[PDB]
Amino acid sequence: HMQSDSAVLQWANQAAIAAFTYNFVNYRDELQASSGFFTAEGWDQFLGALEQSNNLDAVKAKKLVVSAVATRAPIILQKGVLNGRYSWRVQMPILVTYQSASEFTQQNNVVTMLITRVSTLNSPRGIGISQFVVGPA
């Protein structure tokens, strides 16, 4: 297929938000529903990041609902060919909310994604996330 910068951005926006949209009940379904956003190596790294962080443990323990909204528009920091595949480094700030009847906590995070073109044979979108990095401010 074909990819536009603007299309890739809107897509990166969706993927970033989806990653922070789950709860103590549906986490497994939501987790798995997102695998399509990722490339082979991206899925491994994303899963690894999930295990290292304690987030899922607190969400379950405190039985929270996680949501997020884009704080500013996503931007392409850099684009070009990496290892034979056209790629985009996309960054977007977000406001994440962890809440329940008893708790309400918010975080300003910045998501940085490496997005690469892949075969539509395995990923109909034609692109996938190879690296998913979260940080503050």
Numbering used by the authors: 71 to 207
Copy text from the publication.
DotI has one transmembrane domain in its N-terminal region, followed by a periplasmic domain13. DotI is conserved in all of the identified type IVB secretion systems, including the conjugation systems of R64 and related plasmids. Structural analysis of the periplasmic domains of DotI and its R64 ortholog TraM demonstrated that DotI and TraM are structural homologs of the T4ASS protein VirB8.
DotIC crystallized in two distinct forms (Form I and Form II) under different conditions. The structure model of Form I (space group: P21212) was refined to a resolution of 2.2 Å with the working R and the free R factor of 19.1% and 23.5%, respectively, and Form II (space group: I432) to a resolution of 3.5 Å with the working R and the free R factor of 17.9% and 21.6%, respectively. Form I and Form II contain eight and four molecules in its asymmetric unit, respectively, and the structures of these molecules are almost identical. DotIC is a single domain protein composed of four helices (α1 - α4) in one half and one β-sheet in the other half. The sheet is highly twisted at its center with an interruption in β1, therefore can be divided into two parts, Sh1 and Sh2. Sh2 comprises βs, β1a, the C-terminal half of β2 and the N-terminal half of β3, and forms a large cleft with α3 and α4. The cleft of the molecule in the Form I crystal is filled by 2-methyl-2,4-pentanediol (MPD) molecules, which is included in the mother solution for the Form I crystal. DotIC forms a stack of two octameric rings in the Form I crystal. This asymmetric unit contains eight DotIC molecules that form a head-to-head stack of two half rings composed of four monomers each.
